[model samples]
Target: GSSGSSGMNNSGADEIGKLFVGGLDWSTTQETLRSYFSQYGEVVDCVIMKDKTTNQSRGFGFVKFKDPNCVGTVLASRPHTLDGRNIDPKPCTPRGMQPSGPSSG
Candidate 1:
C-alpha cells in the first residue's frame, strides 16, 4: 500500500497547491504556463524546467497555486492542452512517485 491514488490524493511529500506538469513543448515558457493555469486559481509560481547546459526547456515543470483547492478543478479538467500538446499534470510530490529528472529532449 505504498503507492496510493495517482491523481488527486496526497500520500507523501505532497506539496499542497503545487502540481507537476509534463509533456510540454521546449518553447513553452513559465509565463505562458502560469497564464494558462491561472484560469483555475491564483498561480503563485510556475516554472518550466530547463537544462542548465543549454537553457532549453526540459519539457516539464512545477506549478504552485495560491489556493490549494484550485488543484482539484484543474486536475478534473484532465488532458489539458497547451502549445498543441496534451500535458500530463500530477500532484507535486516530495520524493518518490515522480520522474528521476526532467523529461525528454
Candidate 2:
C-alpha cells in the first residue's frame, strides 16, 4: 500500500470560491461580511483579517462563496460600502498570475 495522506487530490481548493475585500473598517466582523456577500449567493465562509498581537482589523479580508459564478456578479457590483466606509472587492487570485491580454468584457 502506498504511504500517502488519505485525502482527495487538489484538496478541492479551486472548487472553494474566494474573493478579496479591501478597505474594511476595523469594526467589521466575519458575520457582517458574510451577510454582505450573501446577497449575491450562498456564502460558505467569510473573514476579516486582524492583527494577531492586538486583534485589530487589518482593513481587509476574504469572502468565499459556494459557487464560483457568484464572484462575477460581485465584481460587477463594484464600489461596495459597509459600515459607512467603501470597500474594494477583487478576485482572490494568486499574485503575479493576472490576466495579460485585453479583457473580453
Candidate 3:
C-alpha cells in the first residue's frame, strides 16, 4: 500500500492523465476511447497510441478531463468498462502531488 504511495510521490508529472487502458482492440481509435469516457462528463481528449510505422493501435492511451473533480466520479460511475476491461481508477498524480511534501511550498 505504502509502496505505491511512497514512490508515487516521486512519480513523474507526465504520468498523470495518461491512464492505462487494457483489453484494447487494435481496431480501437481515439474517438472510441473518447466515446467511452464521454458519458461521464466533458472529455477533453482521449488518444490510443499507435505505431507511427504500422499505424496500429498500441492498446493504451491517456485521457484528459477538463474537470479534475469529475475524474473520481467518472471512474466509479462507469456502467460497463473501458476498452472492455475492469476500470482500474487512479489519481492522475497532479504536479501538486510531488514528493516535495510540505517543505517546498
Candidate 4:
C-alpha cells in the first residue's frame, strides 16, 4: 500500500514522505513529481496544475506528506533548489478560483 507503481523509479520517498510542494512545471504530473521529491519524504498525495482551456501546465501543484510529523525537520535539512529553480513548500491552495455557488437570488 505504501509503495508506488512497480515500474516507477522511487527511491527515498518510499521511506519517509512529508510536506507540500509548489512551483511545479505545468506539464508535470502527480506521478512524475513523486519521483522528484519522494526522496525527501513519503508523498502520499500530489496535484498537478493544468490550464482550463488548453489543459496545459498551470506551473504549480501541491504535495502532501505521509508523515506530517517530519515536515519541519525535513524542510530545515533539505535544499529547496531544483531544476535551477527554488522549490518551496507551500500551503495547499487552488490558483484558479471559482465562485462559491449560485448567487443567492
**TM agreement with the true structure for every prediction:** 0.73, 0.72, 0.58, 0.54
Question: What tens-digit string does per-residue lDDT give for candidate 3 at 40-101?
Answer: 65778777778899888765566776765456565455444555554443445543444433
Worst 10 residues of 2 by lDDT: 96-105
**Model 1, range 3-95, lDDT digits (tens) per residue?**
885554335545867888988887888888998999887999998989999898878988898876677677778879898877888766453
lDDT of each: 0.77, 0.76, 0.59, 0.56
lDDT, candidate 2, at 79: 73
Those runs of model 4 whose alpha carbons end farther than 4 Å from true positions after fitting are: 1-18, 77-79, 83-85, 91-105
lDDT of 1: 0.77
Give lDDT: candidate 4, residue 87.
67
TM-score-best of 1 and 3: 1
* Two-way TM-score contest, 1 vs 2, winner: 1
How do the residues 8-96 of candidate 4 rate in per-residue lDDT, one tens digit apiece? 33233322333556555655667867767677667777777788898865666666676654454445655565455556764232233
Q: Looking at model 3, which ten-residue stretch has the lowest summed lDDT? A: 96-105
**lDDT: the better of candidates 1 and 2:** 1
> Which regions in candidate 1 have their CA more than 4 angstroms from the true location?
1-13, 93-105
Looking at candidate 1, the ten consecutive residues that score lowest on lDDT are: 96-105
Q: Can you list the residue pairs that collide in candidate 4?
A: 13-38, 16-41, 16-42, 17-41, 17-42, 26-57
- Highest-TM-score candidate: 1
Between prediction 1 and prediction 4, the one with superior TM-score is 1
